[PDB]
Design a protein around this motif. Structure first.
Motif, short mmCIF file in Angstrom:
data_model
loop_
_atom_site.label_atom_id
_atom_site.label_comp_id
_atom_site.label_asym_id
_atom_site.label_seq_id
_atom_site.Cartn_x
_atom_site.Cartn_y
_atom_site.Cartn_z
N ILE A 87 46.69 70.27 2.38
CA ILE A 87 47.72 70.93 3.23
C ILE A 87 48.50 69.86 4.00
O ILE A 87 49.75 69.81 3.89
CB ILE A 87 47.05 71.95 4.17
N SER A 88 47.79 69.04 4.76
CA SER A 88 48.40 68.01 5.60
C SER A 88 49.20 67.05 4.72
O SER A 88 50.25 66.62 5.19
CB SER A 88 47.41 67.35 6.51
N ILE A 89 48.87 66.85 3.46
CA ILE A 89 49.62 65.85 2.62
C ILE A 89 50.91 66.48 2.07
O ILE A 89 51.76 65.76 1.45
CB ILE A 89 48.70 65.21 1.54
N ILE A 90 51.16 67.76 2.28
CA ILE A 90 52.52 68.31 1.97
C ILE A 90 53.13 68.95 3.23
O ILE A 90 54.21 69.54 3.10
CB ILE A 90 52.51 69.28 0.76
N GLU A 91 52.53 68.79 4.41
CA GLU A 91 53.12 69.38 5.65
C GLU A 91 53.44 68.28 6.68
O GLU A 91 54.41 68.48 7.45
CB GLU A 91 52.20 70.44 6.26
N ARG A 92 52.66 67.21 6.75
CA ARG A 92 52.85 66.13 7.75
C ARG A 92 53.34 64.89 7.03
O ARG A 92 52.57 64.37 6.21
CB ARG A 92 51.53 65.79 8.44
N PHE A 93 54.54 64.40 7.37
CA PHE A 93 55.14 63.15 6.84
C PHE A 93 55.48 62.15 7.95
O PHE A 93 56.65 61.97 8.30
CB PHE A 93 56.37 63.53 6.04
N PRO A 94 54.47 61.46 8.53
CA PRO A 94 54.69 60.58 9.68
C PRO A 94 55.20 59.15 9.45
O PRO A 94 55.39 58.48 10.45
CB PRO A 94 53.27 60.42 10.27
N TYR A 95 55.36 58.70 8.21
CA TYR A 95 55.46 57.26 7.85
C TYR A 95 56.81 57.03 7.18
O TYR A 95 56.98 57.26 5.98
CB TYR A 95 54.26 56.81 7.01
N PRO A 96 57.80 56.55 7.96
CA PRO A 96 59.15 56.38 7.43
C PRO A 96 59.39 55.03 6.76
O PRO A 96 58.78 54.01 7.12
CB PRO A 96 60.02 56.50 8.68
N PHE A 97 60.30 55.05 5.81
CA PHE A 97 60.85 53.84 5.17
C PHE A 97 62.29 54.11 4.77
O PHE A 97 62.71 55.27 4.71
CB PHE A 97 59.95 53.43 4.00
N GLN A 98 63.05 53.04 4.55
CA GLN A 98 64.51 53.11 4.35
C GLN A 98 64.82 52.44 3.02
O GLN A 98 64.27 51.38 2.72
CB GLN A 98 65.28 52.42 5.48
N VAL A 99 65.70 53.08 2.28
CA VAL A 99 66.26 52.56 1.02
C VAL A 99 67.72 52.29 1.34
O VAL A 99 68.49 53.25 1.51
CB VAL A 99 66.08 53.56 -0.14
N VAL A 100 68.09 51.03 1.46
CA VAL A 100 69.50 50.65 1.76
C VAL A 100 70.21 50.39 0.44
O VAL A 100 69.63 49.72 -0.41
CB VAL A 100 69.57 49.43 2.68
N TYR A 101 71.41 50.92 0.30
CA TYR A 101 72.30 50.64 -0.85
C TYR A 101 73.74 50.62 -0.33
O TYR A 101 73.92 50.43 0.90
CB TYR A 101 72.03 51.64 -1.98
N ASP A 102 74.70 50.78 -1.25
CA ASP A 102 76.16 50.65 -0.97
C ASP A 102 76.50 51.62 0.17
O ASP A 102 76.90 51.13 1.25
CB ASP A 102 76.97 50.82 -2.26
N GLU A 103 76.26 52.92 -0.02
CA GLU A 103 76.42 53.98 1.02
C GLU A 103 75.17 54.01 1.91
O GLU A 103 74.35 54.94 1.74
CB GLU A 103 76.70 55.33 0.35
N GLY A 104 75.03 53.01 2.78
CA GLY A 104 74.11 52.98 3.94
C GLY A 104 72.64 53.19 3.60
O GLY A 104 72.26 53.11 2.43
N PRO A 105 71.77 53.45 4.61
CA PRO A 105 70.34 53.69 4.40
C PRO A 105 69.98 55.16 4.14
O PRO A 105 70.50 56.04 4.79
CB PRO A 105 69.69 53.27 5.72
N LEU A 106 69.11 55.40 3.16
CA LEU A 106 68.46 56.72 2.96
C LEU A 106 67.11 56.62 3.64
O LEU A 106 66.44 55.60 3.41
CB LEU A 106 68.29 57.02 1.47
N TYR A 107 66.77 57.60 4.49
CA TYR A 107 65.49 57.59 5.23
C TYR A 107 64.56 58.59 4.55
O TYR A 107 64.99 59.73 4.30
CB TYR A 107 65.68 57.87 6.72
N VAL A 108 63.38 58.09 4.19
CA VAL A 108 62.29 58.84 3.50
C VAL A 108 61.04 58.76 4.38
O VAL A 108 60.84 57.71 5.02
CB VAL A 108 62.07 58.25 2.10
N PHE A 109 60.30 59.86 4.48
CA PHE A 109 59.05 59.98 5.28
C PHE A 109 57.91 60.36 4.35
O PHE A 109 57.97 61.41 3.63
CB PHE A 109 59.16 61.01 6.40
#
Ligand code: MG
Ligand code: ZN
Length: 164
Positions: A87-109
């Protein structure tokens, strides 16, 4: 070609105005040697739905961690120190990272440190021989028209911090 990684992550959507609310979306992320793409997730049939967006691996300039939010909602609260839980592994996303490309950063948790580490290592791998790779990055999020790290207001603004 062959899928290197498949995960369900929380993605922050492309912000429409500096006074328009932040929409987070649970998405199916796929990484190939060629593309990084997000799909809608068919939970009922347990498969990927429509293709929401694709980034050519070569157009990626940078991949790192982000400094986490100060007051996140419970959906993104990092738990205290110290197996999986369905449950917690599809409900809680506490750990962010960024994918930077031409059109700025995409933020993923990511729901776990381990899954984020896995995704950053594998993406750093597949982008290693990219032409446009950068040596600077924003360690903080772009929120309400500015980076919180350097108040710079351009989304594709040069990184305020140099990579170690
Ligand atoms: Mg499957
Ligand atoms: Zn910055």
């Amino acid at each position: 070609a062959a899928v290197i990684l498949e995960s369900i992550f929380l993605k922050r959507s492309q912000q429409k105005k500096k006074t328009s609310p932040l929409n987070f979306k649970k998405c199916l992320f796929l990484l190939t040697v060629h593309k990084l793409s997000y799909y809608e997730y068919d939970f009922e049939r347990g498969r990927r739905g429509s293709k929401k967006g694709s980034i050519d691996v070569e157009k990626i300039t940078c991949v790192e961690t982000v400094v986490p939010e100060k007051n996140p909602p419970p959906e993104r609260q990092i738990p205290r120190r110290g197996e999986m839980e369905q449950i917690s592994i599809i409900e809680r996303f506490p750990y962010p990272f960024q994918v930077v490309y031409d059109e700025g950063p995409l933020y993923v948790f990511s729901p776990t440190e381990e899954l984020r580490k896995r995704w950053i290592h594998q993406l750093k791998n597949v982008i290693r021989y990219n032409s446009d790779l950068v040596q600077k990055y924003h360690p903080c999020f772009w929120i309400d028209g500015q980076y919180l790290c350097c108040s710079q207001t351009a989304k594709n603004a040069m990184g305020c911090q140099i990579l170690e």
